[PDB]
Every structure is written in C-alpha cells, then in structure tokens.
Amino acid sequence: SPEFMENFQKVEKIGEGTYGVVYKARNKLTGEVVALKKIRLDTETEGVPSTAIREISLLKELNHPNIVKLLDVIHTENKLYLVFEFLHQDLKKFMDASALTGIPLPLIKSYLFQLLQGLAFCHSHRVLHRDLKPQNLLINTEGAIKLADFGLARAFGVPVRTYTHEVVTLWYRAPEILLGCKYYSTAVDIWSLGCIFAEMVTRRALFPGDSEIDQLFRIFRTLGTPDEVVWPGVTSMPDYKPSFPKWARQDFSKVVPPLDEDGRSLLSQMLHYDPNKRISAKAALAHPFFQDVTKPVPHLRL
Numbered sequence: 239s240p241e242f243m244e245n246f247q248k249v250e251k252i253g254e255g256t257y258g259v260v261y262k263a264r265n266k267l268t269g270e271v272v273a274l275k276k277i278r279l280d281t282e283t284e285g286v287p288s289t290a291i292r293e294i295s296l297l298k299e300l301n302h303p304n305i306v307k308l309l310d311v312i313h314t315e316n317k318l319y320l321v322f323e324f325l326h327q328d329l330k331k332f333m334d335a336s337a338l339t340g341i342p343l344p345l346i347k348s349y350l351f352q353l354l355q356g357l358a359f360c361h362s363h364r365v366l367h368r369d370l371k372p373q374n375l376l377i378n379t380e381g382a383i384k385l386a387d388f389g390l391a392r393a394f395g396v397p398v399r400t401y402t403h404e405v406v407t408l409w410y411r412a413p414e415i416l417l418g419c420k421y422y423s424t425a426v427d428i429w430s431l432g433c434i435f436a437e438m439v440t441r442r443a444l445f446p447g448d449s450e451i452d453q454l455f456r457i458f459r460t461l462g463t464p465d466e467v468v469w470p471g472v473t474s475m476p477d478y479k480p481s482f483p484k485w486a487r488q489d490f491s492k493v494v495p496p497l498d499e500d501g502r503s504l505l506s507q508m509l510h511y512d513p514n515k516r517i518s519a520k521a522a523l524a525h526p527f528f529q530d531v532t533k534p535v536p537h538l539r540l
C-alpha cells in the first residue's frame with residue numbers, strides 16, 4: 239500500500255544534513271516514528287545523469303546494520319521524501335555532550351569497529367561514502383552507529399540542491415583529493431575515518447582547515463610534507479607545487495596523547511599519505527587495537 243505524505247505527522251526537526259532539514263515524524267497509520275528527508279529535485283538540464291542514477295541504485299541495494307535503513311521513497315510534486323528508520327542523535331552531538339569528559343575508550347573502539355564494518359561492506363559493493371564526518375554518523379540507544387548522508391549528490395552531479403547550514407567537509411578530506419588526483423579510491427573514506435578516530439580521542443578536530451591550501455598545510459605540518467619516498471608520485475599530482483613549505487613529521491605522542499602503540503599503529507595506517515599503502519577497512523578490522531572490542535551502551539539525555 240503506497241505511503242503518502244499526508245500519512246505522516248511532523249514531530250520535530252532533528253537535524254539538517256547535506257539535504258536540508260531532517261524531521262522526526264510519526265506514521266499516522268502504524269504509529270511508527272521515522273526520520274524524513276526532503277529532496278528537492280531540479281531538472282536544471284535534462285535530468286539526473288545515468289551514472290548518478292546507477293550510484294543511487296547501488297546505494298539503495300545496501301542492507302547492513304551499520305548503514306541507516308531507507309524504508310521507503312515517496313514521490314509527489316517535483317519532490318521526493320526519503321523515509322528512514324529513526325535514530326536519536328549523531329556522533330557530533332554526542333561528542334560535544336561528552337567533550338568535557340571524553341567518549342570512553344571502549345565506546346570509541348566499538349564505534350570505530352562498526353564504522354569500519356559498514357565501510358568494508360560499502361567498499362566491497364563499489365560504494366564510497368565520500369563525506370565522512372561526525373555530523374553524518376548516527377547512533378542509537380542500543381550502541382550501534384550508522385553511516386548516513388553519503389556524498390553522492392555532489393559527487394555525481396545529481397540535480398538536487400544541497401546544504402543548509404554551511405560547510406566544514408574540508409577537515410576530513412583526503413590529501414590526494416586536495417592535490418587534485420584524477421581518480422581517487424576507497425582509501426579516501428579510511429582517511430576521513432582516521433581523522434574522526436583522532437577527534438574522538440582528543441576531543442578536537444585533527445585538521446580544521448578553512449581553505450583547500452590551508453587544509454593541506456595543516457596536514458603537512460602534522461604528518462610532514464610528503465615527498466617521493468613517502469608517497470611515490472606526489473610531486474607530479476595536478477595541484478602539487480614544489481613551493482610547498484617543508485615540515486617534518488610530528489610524534490603521535492603529541493598528536494594523540496591518550497593513544498598507545500596499538501591505537502597509534504592503527505591511526506598511522508589510516509592516515510598514510512599514499513592511498514595505495516593506506517590500510518583498507520577490511521584489514522583494519524583485524525588490527526590488534528580491536529582485540530578486546532565490545533558493544534557498550536552509550537548514555538544520552540534529550
């Protein structure tokens with residue numbers, strides 16, 4: 239039986255991702271609470287590009303405990319309403335609420351482990367997230383964390399307006415993208431998650447840049463300016479300039495003080511400059527940092 243928007247009662251705005259406001263709503267017929275996303279389509283040109291349609295189809299095929307569940311898609315007047323399972327809060331809000339104490343290590347480990355499981359699944363199905371950040375990660379009272387707000391629209395020219403509040407995506411952007419690589423790989427998601435891992439541990443974003451070049455320099459100042467030894471081919475990348483300053487790599491004892499050899503070993507592999515050497519999500523799941531991983535239940539108030 240088709241669902242119609244009249245079937246839903248808005249309860250409250252719970253967020254605003256790359257597609258604007260996200261509303262918690264109640265299904266009038268079943269009483270099920272859901273999250274609704276409003277997509278405004280603009281046939282600016284001929285329509286959604288074939289490749290974009292295929293990528294949307296690929297994302298839709300994914301069924302995994304660590305990917306927010308899309309329950310239905312309602313079409314009406316030049317608009318689409320995405321009906322998703324309802325999740326209480328995002329990782330960004332949770333970290334801010336835990337900033338003065340910090341998210342406990344067992345939870346950090348559980349969330350990282352789960353995000354790697356979700357990414358491994360996506361990557362094996364040829365799906366990348368492309369815009370991983372704390373704001374697009376959803377957590378439930380059960381202790382699960384899920385991927386949401388995939389960067390598909392801006393990555394494949396989907397004719398749909400994006401954004402609402404602003405932008406801060408640069409902070410988690412992989413260096414090969416900042417250097418203008420012709421083709422990037424699944425490794426870009428691992429870099430972003432590595433930045434998130436460090437952020438949960440230190441309680442502060444790792445590379446909070448304000449422009450592409452500022453983002454690059456913040457990365458270089460911490461991990462060292464890459465050269466051909468560390469990253470073969472870096473000096474020939476489209477936007478690489480020999481004039482870049484030369485910074486030496488900093489010790490992780492300074493970058494992420496709380497972490498030990500296991501956590502630092504894993505983080506170093508997730509932030510490797512060379513995409514071909516950066517650890518994969520599948521390999522990361524086998525890292526010793528996860529030997530004692532559990533599934534703690536977070537404490538959240540509303």
Ligand SMILES: O=S(=O)(O)c1cccc2cccc(Nc3ccccc3)c12
Pocket residue numbers: 277286294311313318320396398
């Ligand atoms: O494939 S759908 O499940 O609709 C879909 C689901 C989720 C997001 C979408 C974004 C743009 C276009 C779609 N398709 C579309 C296709 C025909 C007409 C209007 C929109 C999207």
Ligand SMILES: O=S(=O)(O)c1cccc2cccc(Nc3ccccc3)c12
Pocket residue numbers: 257275277294297298305306307308320385386387388389390391396398
């Ligand atoms: O909303 S997201 O959380 O990314 C999302 C999460 C989980 C499954 C999705 C399936 C299709 C489209 C999405 N978003 C989408 C919306 C508009 C344009 C292109 C893709 C999906």
Ligand SMILES: COc1ccc(O)c(-c2nc(N)nc(N)n2)c1
Pocket residue numbers: 252253254255260273275306322323324325326327328373376386387
């Ligand atoms: C598909 O995107 C979704 C799907 C379901 C959701 O519950 C959310 C969401 N939920 C909350 N509480 N905050 C925020 N920021 N987002 C987002």
